[PDB]
Design a protein around this nucleic acid. Structure first.
Ligand SMILES: [Zn+2]
Lengths: 106, 70, 70, 71, 35
RNA sequence: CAGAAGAAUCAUCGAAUCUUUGAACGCACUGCGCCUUUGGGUUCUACCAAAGGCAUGCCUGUUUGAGUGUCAUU
RNA sequence: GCAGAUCUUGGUGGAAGUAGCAUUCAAAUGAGAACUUUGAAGACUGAAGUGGGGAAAGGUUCCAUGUGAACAGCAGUUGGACAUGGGUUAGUCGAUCCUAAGAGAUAGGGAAGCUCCGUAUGAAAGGCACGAUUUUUCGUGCCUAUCGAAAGGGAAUCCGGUUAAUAUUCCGGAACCAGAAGGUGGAAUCAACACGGCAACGUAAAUGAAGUUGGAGACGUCGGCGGGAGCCCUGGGAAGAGUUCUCUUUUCUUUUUAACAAACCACACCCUGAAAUCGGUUUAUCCGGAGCUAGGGUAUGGUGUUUGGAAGAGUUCAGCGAUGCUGAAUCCGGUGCGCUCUCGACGGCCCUUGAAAAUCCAACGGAAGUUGUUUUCACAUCUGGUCGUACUCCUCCAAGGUGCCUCUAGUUGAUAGAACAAUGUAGAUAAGGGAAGUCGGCAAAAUGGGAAUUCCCACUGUCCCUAUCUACUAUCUA
RNA sequence: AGCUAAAUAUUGGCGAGAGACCGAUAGCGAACAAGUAGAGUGAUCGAAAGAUGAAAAGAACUUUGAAAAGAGAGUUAAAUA
């Protein structure tokens, strides 16, 4: 059967996304589904982080703290490799500065 | 009348600036009855109509008889 | 709607002041569906043992309104 | 539609795009009027409405705009 | 249309109700006119 | 016509009332705010309602200021 | 003081009753029925509808009842007409909020002036914390408009039933979101703000000031592959209606599970590892000492499994008696370059390397802190205004079979009737000849062909020479 | 550098009194629903339209017709109002 849109927002667009379902009354119906969520992305590299559910921005508030962050430094903001790269670079830079200061003082 | 005897809802012609809160206060303070729901619309003639659903503790027919428009 | 498998839990939810009514459903597979109506969720318990259903039935507090097959 | 109802004069002469009434010049503070438009002036001048307050003033003048109550 | 301002509902109602038969008793009180 | 019985679709007129607008003035033009006071409820840190306020330029005074502006202070 | 001004205004003539403007039968209703209503028959659109919806736009035009004044190139018992009443119900759908290109007030500056330029501009362009109170006169520190999108961004609703006319709005049932306080229980601490795993990371919780960042929002286009859903195809099972001298396990029709809530169910990364005799692998050779194949893990779950919701609903059959009551069934498959919609994983082309903001989250940072402190953990409690919503129609939904036919659905209206001469238009056939027609193969039939506008061949009502048929027109009637 | 009554002007405003004026195609566009109906996206444009009788006494009643109406009848000085 030909089905019409539930709303009156003519000229269906990106927002107008529907799904066809069969009701217990044996009727085919348009069900408007909101856009899928987006998983957070790493700040340094940009790959989506691991262990964070892919949900909507407004929805993220409902989650608990542990479900939005990872138990590590910069957890929920930087990937594990990015954290590793950040840590080793900082230490090598500090050592490069400590030897440079040692060379200048002698 | 069908709504009154079926769904325990009274239908009123209300003021244009009245909102759901004020209609509830006005109905509560004029007939000593507690509404559980108010749904309103604006008729094409520029008048507002309110469907006031009463509690099961009260009978809309009794209130309608008391008002006198029954 | 929540499906509860723990009978004791169904008792505790029933003893909770939130529970208002309970329904007993007799299915063709000889299961009794105890559907307890709460504020937010309708808690159902499917019991396969017939005598368990009856011994469940009067262990429900008398103040709660139990109802026959819907 | 190129014109809608004007909030000031109530005539369907409010140009949507220019956001200006072709009749009274709304929303300019002054009313649009022209001396070549003699018939246009007489269509909207004083007396074409109620003049509710001016009738009060004209009626109050004879007694000197007195206030108070009779004895 | 449908998404119409409330003033329009009053504006439309008054314009339409002007087109209304003048009562019989109205005539009986001497004189009453159209337009 | 019905109905009513200091009447009146009366006159005069010094008391008032005077919706939304409009120079039109909290901001916008179905709406959206802020401030003060008060009140309601069958529920009182919540919700609701009510009343009174909040435009611009300029003047007089008031208060609070700013200035490496002009000075004084043994 | 009118005969005239292609006079003015009004009235009225001849022209002139002139030019003209796919249904059939019975019945019901009615004063009246070519046009209304019902049933039968015959037809028309044929999913690209004469279908079903919305935007803009109209504004009551929706529905019911009445009437048949004016409308009706006819009429009506009739219209979207007239009269009388009724009809649009939302925390979740839109608007409301955000920003876009731009507009625009303010600061300033022009201009005799209505006004113009100007939008962080040489504007004093607005905040936050600290403190036994500071000569009871405030010190110190820190950071520094508005309008414009009912198609962009954005918290949250589903099913069944219900009206003469309104439904994601109402009724029944079932959920969800946002904010608000306390309370209950659980969790962490005089080892000050939890533990575990090599790791990716996990969990019922597990404080985080100033200050500093990060992410979501948020982003081009094309192609192929994979997944799921609906639809289409089809095997049986059941139900009813067929057809049936016979044949026909046969013909046709139907066979439902919503939001939401539960447990489980596969691409990136980690660990062991050190590889070419090159391995793994796409439909499309891509990656690999920047660590392959292989083994074990982690997360992302597109989905699927089992339920709950939920049969009590809906549908279809049988009955029995206000519309009730009682039975049953509503099943098991198979699938395909199928169509519609969506998701994942790639591969190109880009060059044009691919909006903004509101809003929400996280990180770094370490201020503060027996009675307490914290808790983004679980549960209960409450609330959700304002406006749009009726109806009509640039855009949505779009079956099957082989340009046709049909199902679903929607019409049978467009003033009618009778006759069929001449006329005109259109479409055909025609003996013999075959372009002799005309300035001419214009149009037809041939299939048009061959060779250099011409020639040859073929063809035909162009012509000799017209004749016949059909529908329409034309004619008359109301 | 500055102010100043009166005599003067006055198609508007609040009133008043007149006329060798016009008499419903006239006189204002408008004697009456007149800047009304209506037209145009808009600025604008813009009409036609006065008279029953003294009194509504506005025609009861009967009949024909589905009705609109007709015919008898009635009111009136008069329905040649
Ligand atoms: Zn105006």
């Amino acid at each position: 059967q030909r089905v019409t849109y539930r709303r009156r927002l003519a000229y269906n667009t990106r927002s107008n996304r529907t799904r066809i379902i069969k009701t217990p009354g044996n009727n085919i119906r348009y069900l408007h589904i909101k856009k899928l969520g987006t998983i957070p992305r790493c700040g340094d590299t940009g790959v989506p982080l691991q262990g964070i559910p892919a949900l909507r921005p407004r929805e993220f508030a409902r989650l608990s703290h542990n479900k939005k962050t990872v138990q590590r430094a910069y957890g929920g903001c930087l990937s594990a490799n990015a954290v590793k790269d950040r840590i080793v670079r900082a230490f090598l830079i500090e050592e490069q500065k400590i030897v440079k200061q040692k060379l200048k003082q002698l | 009348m069908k709504k009154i005897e079926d769904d325990n809802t009274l239908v009123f012609h209300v003021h244009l600036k009245a909102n759901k809160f004020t209609i509830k206060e006005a109905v509560r303070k004029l007939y000593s009855v507690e509404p559980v729901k108010i749904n309103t619309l604006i008729r094409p003639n520029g008048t507002k109509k309110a469907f006031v659903k009463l509690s099961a503790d009260a009978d809309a027919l009794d209130v309608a008889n008391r008002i006198g428009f029954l | 709607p929540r499906q509860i498998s723990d009978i004791k839990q169904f008792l505790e939810i029933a003893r909770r002041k939130d529970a208002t009514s309970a329904r007993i459903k007799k299915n063709t597979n000889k299961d009794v569906k105890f559907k307890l109506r709460c504020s937010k969720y309708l808690y159902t318990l499917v019991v396969a043992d017939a005598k368990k259903a009856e011994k469940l039935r009067q262990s429900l507090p008398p103040d709660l309104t139990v109802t026959e097959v819907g | 539609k190129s014109h809608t109802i004007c909030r000031r004069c109530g005539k369907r002469s409010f140009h949507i795009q220019k956001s200006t009434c072709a009749c009274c010049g709304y929303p300019a503070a002054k009313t649009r009027s022209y001396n070549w438009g003699a018939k246009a002036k007489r269509r909207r001048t004083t007396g074409t409405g109620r003049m509710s307050y001016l009738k009060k003033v004209h009626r109050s003048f004879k007694n000197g705009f007195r206030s108070g109550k009779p004895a | 249309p449908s998404h119409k301002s409330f003033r329009t509902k009053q504006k439309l109602a008054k314009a339409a109700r002007q087109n209304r038969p003048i009562p019989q008793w109205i005539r009986l009180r001497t004189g009453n006119t159209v337009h």
